[PDB]
């Protein structure tokens, strides 16, 4: 599954660098750049709401992603799919990834990243392909 692999790589690298706080094909790099610009912006603009959501969710640990999965599934339960919701999901994923680091230094952000990727790729695979995948993602948020 190439789409899954690419998605997991992109999403993982963003969450990891957001969590640790530092940065270490072409499409993947452009997507990560777009994700950095839009995703950081979403986190800054909606920190209060994100904080509240996080507090209410009360995530204990890195492996505690089941509630998050239910939330991502429910987001699309109205039958609406768009890039805006997708990037906001990933943004919140990074916000959560940071907090886990607050709770402990050594958390693997992988379970969180894979949790997000599974919902996107499994449930919206044909939507993603129709939208031109991550190339479509980059184009949509272009400035």
């Amino acid at each position: 599954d190439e789409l899954y692999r690419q998605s997991l790589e992109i999403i993982s690298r963003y969450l990891r660098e957001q969590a640790t706080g530092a940065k270490d094909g072409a499409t993947s790099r452009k997507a990560l750049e777009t994700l950095r610009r839009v995703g950081d912006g979403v986190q800054r603009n909606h920190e209060t709401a994100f904080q509240g959501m996080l507090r209410k969710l009360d995530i204990k640990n890195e492996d505690d992603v089941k509630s998050l999965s239910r939330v991502m599934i429910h987001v699309f339960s109205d039958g609406v799919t768009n890039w805006g919701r997708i990037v906001t999901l990933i943004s919140f994923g990074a916000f959560v990834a940071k907090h886990l680091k607050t709770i402990n230094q050594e958390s693997c952000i992988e379970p969180l990243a894979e949790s997000i990727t599974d919902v996107l790729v499994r449930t919206k695979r044909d939507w993603l392909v129709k939208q031109r995948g991550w190339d479509g993602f980059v184009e949509f948020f272009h400035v």
Binding site: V38, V42, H46, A49, G52, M53, K56, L57, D58, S67, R70, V71, M72, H74, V75, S77, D78, V80, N82, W83, G84, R85, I86, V87, T88, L89, F92, F140, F141
Partner: peptide, 23 residues
Amino acid sequence: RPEIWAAQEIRRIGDENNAYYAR
């Protein structure tokens, strides 16, 4: 419920962003 509330927030912020970039 926290999950539903989270979903609605993400749905609201997502749609805001989508409308914004939709040109």
